[PDB]
Amino acid sequence: SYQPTPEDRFTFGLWTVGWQGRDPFGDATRPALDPVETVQRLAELGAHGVTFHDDDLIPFGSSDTERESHIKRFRQALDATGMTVPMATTNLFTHPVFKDGGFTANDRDVRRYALRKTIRNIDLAVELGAKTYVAWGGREGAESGAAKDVRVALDRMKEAFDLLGEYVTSQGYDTRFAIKPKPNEPRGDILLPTVGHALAFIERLERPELYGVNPEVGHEQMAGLNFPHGIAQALWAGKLFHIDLNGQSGIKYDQDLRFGAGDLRAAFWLVDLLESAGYEGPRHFDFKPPRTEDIDGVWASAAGCMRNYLILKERAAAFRADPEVQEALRASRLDELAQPTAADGVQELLADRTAFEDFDVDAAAARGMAFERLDQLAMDHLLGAR
Amino acid sequence: SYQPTPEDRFTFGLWTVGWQGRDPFGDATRPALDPVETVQRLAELGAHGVTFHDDDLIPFGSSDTERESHIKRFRQALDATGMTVPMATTNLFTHPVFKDGGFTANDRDVRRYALRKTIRNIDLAVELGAKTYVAWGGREGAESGAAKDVRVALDRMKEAFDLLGEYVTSQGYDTRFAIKPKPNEPRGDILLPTVGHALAFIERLERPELYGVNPEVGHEQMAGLNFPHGIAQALWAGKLFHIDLNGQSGIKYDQDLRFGAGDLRAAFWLVDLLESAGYEGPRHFDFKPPRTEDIDGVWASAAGCMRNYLILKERAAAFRADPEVQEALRASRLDELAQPTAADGVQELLADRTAFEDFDVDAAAARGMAFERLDQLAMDHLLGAR
Amino acid sequence: SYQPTPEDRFTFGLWTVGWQGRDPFGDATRPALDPVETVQRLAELGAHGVTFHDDDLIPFGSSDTERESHIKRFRQALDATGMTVPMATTNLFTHPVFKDGGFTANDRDVRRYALRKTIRNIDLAVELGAKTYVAWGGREGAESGAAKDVRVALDRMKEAFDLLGEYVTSQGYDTRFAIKPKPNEPRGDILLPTVGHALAFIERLERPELYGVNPEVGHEQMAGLNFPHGIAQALWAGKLFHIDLNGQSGIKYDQDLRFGAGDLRAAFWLVDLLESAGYEGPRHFDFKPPRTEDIDGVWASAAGCMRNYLILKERAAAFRADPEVQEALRASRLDELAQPTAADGVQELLADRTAFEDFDVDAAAARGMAFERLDQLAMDHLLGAR
Amino acid sequence: SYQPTPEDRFTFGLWTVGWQGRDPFGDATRPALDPVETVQRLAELGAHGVTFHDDDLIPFGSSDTERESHIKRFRQALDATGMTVPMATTNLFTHPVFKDGGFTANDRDVRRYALRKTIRNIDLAVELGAKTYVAWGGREGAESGAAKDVRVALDRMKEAFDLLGEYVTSQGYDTRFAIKPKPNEPRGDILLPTVGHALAFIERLERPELYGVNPEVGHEQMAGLNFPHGIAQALWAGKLFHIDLNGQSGIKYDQDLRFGAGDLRAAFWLVDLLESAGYEGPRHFDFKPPRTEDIDGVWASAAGCMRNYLILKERAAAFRADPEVQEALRASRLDELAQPTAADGVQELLADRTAFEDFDVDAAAARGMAFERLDQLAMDHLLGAR
Ligand SMILES: [Mg+2]
Ligand SMILES: [Mg+2]
Ligand SMILES: [Mg+2]
Ligand SMILES: [Mg+2]
Ligand SMILES: [O-]
Ligand SMILES: [O-]
Ligand SMILES: [O-]
Ligand SMILES: [O-]
């Protein structure tokens, strides 16, 4: 059928299948997973690799020998399975010291600690072979207006990303940063709340080339945005450094459902885009198996993430390969969208009477776009009705 | 009391108090307003100026002599009142020829016409003294996935903004462009849907300095975003070229309520930001008097736009001037947010044991932020309870 | 593939395929359709019937003799095709006299007119064979707080529906009323905004049995609610008199996409529910072909409505018939949910030590619900990957 | 300024000021509070009473004698302060045995336990003097479609509330039940998601009169609904048994901000309604002090709750008492909305030519409703600019 192999580049965070089920209104429904057991179970499922936050791999406050021992046994599981670590990140949101943020905390001593905690994990991530380092600022934001001056907070966020870029340049590390946007939760509003705000921010950093975005399906959907459209803008800007896949069923709390769940047609158009644009990075799943599930349901949800990408990849590829669909695209003039509007230049456009004075606006206005026929061919292919 | 004068820089679009009340489910409840009568009534109210779309001033399809006559009588009303025209824009969304967009229409001949219609109105706007030219692409987008290839559509949008920049540079015009973001409506999803996506886009134009954003209160609120936060990012980037003020009561269709209505606390924090950042541009109202109203209610709604800005400007200025509030800000460490995190540099931060190895995380974690006290002082000032 | 037959009970309103394309920001993209041509084209497509608002069949303001002729043509087209008229409604939202509503307008004379316009259309619907009469109070509500006292307006809404009940009872008509809820648009907030609010209101009417709901897929999704769950509560209450099918992509303006589009997994769970509950009323499509389409695009979108109901009907029937799904439902204890909690009363429950004193809370807490495996089987059936 | 007195009937749950700060992405920022210290601090602040979940007063799993002592301390603090206990509820959401719900769990033995845990707390609430018993089915629902048959789960929900009704009737207790709706979180979709759905459900119970609603400001705003409108329908139905006050800034996770924050104009219209309808139950605050605050920040936020109710009470009373507002209501025909539409029946309506044949539709269509002038007077009163 649709069996994942390492060649598909599917990756999972330690915190995803390892989530215990504690939420805002309830306690853990599952026991803690050992990182070593997660590496082996995921390898058996056909995953290509794993990612971590520092505190997922090493308990907060571990002494250096406890730290040594956690990394050592993690690395032996990696080597024994052939599993890779493509990405890593810092937890700057769980501990109560981060209750007003990490990099933009109002307290200056807490911003220095957040930067020291992050550099320590950049060194370890590079050792394990990570090529992308993610920054998700879940606690950077506010619930009230005078609590955070946002222009000065953006000065502190730029200062912190510029310091991290100076550090990896001076160490000569081959590692890139990717910002993960989220509109809200756990703060009332988070800074750089969508893909577009993170892309604009990057352009003001001292070394913009070192930074890109790591968008999450459900986060852009919490602001009611079109995730395929946000991803196309990121790819148009050359900034899609990584991507987090999951499901979300509308504007509400962050659900992190398994990929395919939530908005199924957006998942289809996202796979169509990634595959036709030739995205070559990891297909990473940041989801949380519902707390109704035991450990057998945890691996069934994680296996469903990979299966749904592969069914959808197949349906999108049959769609674009269908001659009838190719005909429908010409009918809807998707080939004329690819033509330059005025490669003849502005002066030639201004002198062209068929562009304005002799343009028949009502004949143009009457041409049907034939978009409903095209979308029902896309619907038939997704459902396997062709 | 709180009487507006031209010194307050309040401006209104011809289409706002001139809206007739036709919506998706209903016909006009009001007669058309003459542009000349709008200029005089707004001047009597204490407005500073007016803005227009080309088709508001000159009926679509007017011959050049009809065109001449409309502009001539408009300009005599302007001169007779001392009213200015700070901004102007193109209508690229009403006529059925724009049903798939203007600059990103799949049809190439329609993209050339959209660019010719826009250049014609740039010439007229500069004559009338407009310094900002707005582009609101309400029809650039899609209701379905294969209908619009978004990377090629962004190539057509960049091509069109680069052609407009070449044109005004070659004419030597002193005029800037400002992009107006909107998430959806009338398309299922619109391209560059928020302030952040428009700011990121600008950085890929050939002449980025010629372009900025013109955010609208209710549009960022349709994606559930914090409008004061979006505005602070625009000001941090030096890109707030203009601003459209109105009210919106949540994520639903675009209401364009009078400013102050909708989210009242966001309106207060927006005025606090504009006034403390020293924004010097027009305070423009793009709102629509509810269709329940007659022409007397139209001028009462428009007068309420200006009154609510002035009451709020006064409350925010009393807030920041209160010694008790200034004390509360120090208590919440808003002064330490202004201090550089590590001006001592990365190597000095890495050697600083108090930033990590000797940092007392639990003492830091226990410091209360005192943000609820600060926000209740902001609440008492807004309500005049102090 | 999958052809509609009259036995499928698919129906469409005159206003759906007849929408000309005007929206809040644009003029009509299509010509008006003649009702008799709509009846013919729909019968050729395999629909079973049509519905109408009085102003869709007879132009507002028609004399008794212009009325006569409109009605005569229409009934002639019906007779000729064998098309039925299952439901009808009144337009109490388009004309500007209804700008503050119809049954709950503040002006008493407007409330009286609204009731007289409605009774006139009830007599016509009854001779054409309609068994359901729909009420969509699209203008009942407000944009501001003191503009409507909602307790007194519910008094006027109750009085209106009680006067309609008295009237159909004294004429001995076999017609029933169905309320269509909608949360907002065109009013800032509409009265009876969801299925739940309409169901509760019905219980305070003089004759509750004459009244039920006509829920619409996209309206409950404009409040972010689960449409299948709302339908299940209406069926549990014995009040699903009719249903309106279409698609909506999230919380935003009322889109009226063709059925199947929008939230596709919710369309699958709705067809599964309607078919397993054996609902036997019409499957009515209230949608609007995108204004990007010409008339050929209209009939393609109207036929895609029916095709998507039929594909989903077949996928849901395959899901429920699969032995492995039936085993998965037993494993998630869907059979045990159907067993009464305490059929021997509360004194037998209070005496039972296994229900409290001796209940092993931690062993019960540790059972997995096996919900992700069941939902991935559901996912494989929808995509035809099973 | 504006001090709370016991006559104001302000109450708070033990869980509100006692929230320790754990959220989905972080650990507790504050220490647990002792109930007797909460009762004392709240009595000093001028509150009138406290509420509780059984697991807030007695730790889950306490023996009968640990129960004994918890209860004894608490009642001693109450006796000493004169604090009342107006309402109580059961925690059927925190413990992992409730991961698929309590009354509608798929497992029958879990449903039985849920009912036994609830009855145990009803006997205690009745001896402490509670006259309202709240049900918040936070775990009743699902993240996926086949995981819950909603018609059968409404059967189990009805059976549970009928068993509770039989029990309080056979004990002769004077307690009434109130259902708190919530649309989602922690479940993907919760059953009875809004005030309307809870009101309709009550009408199918064996003894409807024992049951009403306990609506919460932030929960109806998570569906984008108008909370004052929902409250008005509950008061119209005679079912507002209790209310929960707090703030929410839009559709997103349940924030539980202090009352006054969030949507401030909706808080103003809610106090105006509660005070003009003469609602006499408790004004209960169910909120969570932000986890950014220490314990001093907790009591500052709890006192800001009461202060904002009292300022708004005074602004609303001033709005309604102003002669000019009373003249503006007459001008918007708020008096005419209170007059019956057709008090002489439908045959007098049918005979009346002024209601249809001779009604001048265009002159009625042309009356302005004067709603913006009335809403700006409302705006001036809230801001104390009048
Ligand atoms: Mg997430
Ligand atoms: Mg707008
Ligand atoms: Mg609709
Ligand atoms: Mg809550
Ligand atoms: O996440
Ligand atoms: O707008
Ligand atoms: O609709
Ligand atoms: O809550």
Domain ranges of chain C: 1-386
Distance in Å, alpha carbon of C147 to nearest chain D alpha carbon: 6
Q: How many Å apart are CA B288 and CA B244, to the nearest integer?
A: 12
Give the nearest partner residue to B329 out of A146, A150, A340, using CB atoms: A146
The residue to which tokens 């015009």 are assigned = B173
Whether residue A258 contacts residue A302, with contact meaning beta carbons closer than 8 Å, is answered with yes
| Half-sphere exposure at residue B197, Cβ-oriented, CA atoms within 13 angstroms | 26
Q: Which CA distances in Å does D319 have to B260, C144, D276? A: 17, 14, 12
**What is the identity of the amino acid at A328?**
A
The 3-class SS string of chain A reads: CCCCCHHHCEEEEHHHHCCCCCECCECCCCCCCCHHHHHHHHHHHCCCEEEEEHHHHCCCCCCHHHHHHHHHHHHHHHHHHCCECCEEECCCCCCHHHCCCCCCCCCHHHHHHHHHHHHHHHHHHHHCCCCEEEECCCCCEECCHHHCCHHHHHHHHHHHHHHHHHHHHHHCCCCEEEECCCCCCCCCEECCCCHHHHHHHHCCCCCHHHEEECCEHHHHHCCCCCHHHHHHHHHHCCCECCCEECECCCCCCCCCECECECCHHHHHHHHHHHHHCCCCCCEEECCCCCCCCCHHHHHHHHHHHHHHHHHHHHHHHHHHHCHHHHHHHHHCCHHHHCCCCCCCCHHHHHHCHHHCCCCCHHHHHHCCCCHHHHHHHHHHHHCCCC
Residue A265 near residue B142 (C-beta atoms within 8 A): no
Residue type, A169: T
Ligand 7 pocket, Cβ-based, cut-off 6 angstroms: C 216, 254, 256, 286
Is residue A282 within 8 Å of residue A326, measured between CB atoms?
no
Distance from the Cα of C366 to chain D's closest Cα (Å) equals: 7
Catalytic residue status for D48: no
Dist. CA D124 → ligand 7 center (Å): 50
Ligand 6 site residues, Cβ closer than 6 angstroms: B 216, 254, 256, 286
Does ligand 8 come within 6 angstroms of the Cβ of D254?
Answer: yes
Interface contact A334, partner C, CB < 8 A: no
Question: How many other CB atoms sit within 10 Å of the CB of residue A313?
Answer: 18
CB pairs under 8 A between A and D: 112
Cβ atoms of residues B243 and B279 within 8 Å: yes
How far apart are alpha carbons A333 and C344 in whole angstroms?
69
3-state secondary structure of D194: coil
Any atom of ligand 8 within 6 Å of the Cβ of D263: no
- Ion ligand 2 neighbours, Cβ < 5 Å: B 254, 256
Neighbours of D26 (CB within 10 A): 19
Ligand 3 centroid from CA C251, angstroms: 12
> CA-nearest residue of chain B to A197?
B196
Q: For residue D1, give every residue at least 6 positions away whose Cβ sits within 8 Å of its Cβ, in sequence order, or none.
A: B380, B385, B386, D307
Task: Give contacts of C259 with chain A, Cβ < 8 Å.
Answer: none
Interacting residues of C286 by C-beta distance below 8 A, sequence separation 6+: C12, C13, C16, C216, C244, C245, C246, C256
Question: Percentage helix, strand, coil, to 5, in chain D?
Answer: 50, 10, 40
Q: Which residues of chain A lie closer than 8 angstroms to D143, CB-CB? A: 255, 257, 290, 292
Q: Which residue type is seen at A62?
A: S
DSSP string, D223-265: TT--HHHHHHHHHHTT-B---EE-B--SSSS---BPBTBSSHH
Burial class (CB within 10 angstroms; exposed 0-12, middle 13-18, buried 19+) of B315: buried
Name every chain A residue with its beta carbon within 8 A of the beta carbon of B371: 142-144, 147
Q: Is the CB of residue C271 less than 8 Å from the CB of residue C313?
A: yes
End-to-end, the C-alpha distance of chain B in Å comes to 18
Count of residues for chain A? 386
Q: How far is the CA of D153 from the centre of ligand 4 (A)?
A: 23
Q: How far is D51 from chain C (nearest CA, A)?
A: 24
Question: For this structure, is D56 an active site residue?
Answer: yes
Q: Shortest CA distance to D279 belongs to which of D353, D212, D201?
A: D212
What phi and psi, each to the nearest 5 degrees, are found at residue D261?
-70, 170
Structure-token match 């479609």, residue found: D145
Q: From the CA of A202, how far away is ligand 6's center (Å)?
A: 29
* Catalytically active residues of A, by annotation: 53, 56
Q: Distance, CA D180 to ligand 5 centroid (Å)? A: 29
Using alpha carbons, select from A150, D300, D295, A188 the residue that is nearest to residue B367: D295
Q: Do C132 and C86 contact (CB within 8 A), yes or no?
A: yes
Task: Say which of D29, D308, D384 has its CB closest to residue B384.
Answer: D384
Contacts of D99 in chain C (CB under 8 A): 365, 369
- CA–CA distances in Å: residue D196 to residues A305, B305, D234: 37, 35, 8
Q: In the structure, how many helices (H) and strands (E) does chain C have? A: 15, 10
Tell me the residues of chain B between 152 and 211 that have a Cβ less than 8 Å away from chain D: none
Using a 6 Å cutoff on CB, does residue D244 contact ligand 8?
A: no
Show Cβ contacts of residue C262 under 8 Å, excluding neighbours closer than 6 positions: C217, C218, C221, C246, C247, C248, C249, C255
How far apart are alpha carbons B233 and B238 in whole angstroms? Answer: 9
Size of interface A-B (CB pairs under 8 A): 314
Question: Distance between CA atoms of A208 and A179, rounded to whole angstroms?
Answer: 12
Q: Residue A98: what are its φ and ψ, rounded to 5°?
A: -90, 20
Cβ of A376 under 8 Å from any chain C Cβ? Answer: yes
CATH 2.60.40.1930 is held by the domain A1-386: no
Give the closest residue to D315 by CA, choosing from C142, B385, B265, B301.
B385
Which residues are registered as beta bridge partners of D176?
Answer: D132
- Asked if D289 is an interface residue toward chain C (Cβ–Cβ < 8 A), one would say no
Specify the resolution in Å.
Answer: 1.8
**Which two tokens mark B10?**
């309040």
Q: Is the CB–ligand 5 distance for residue A256 below 6 Å? A: yes
This structure was determined by: X-ray
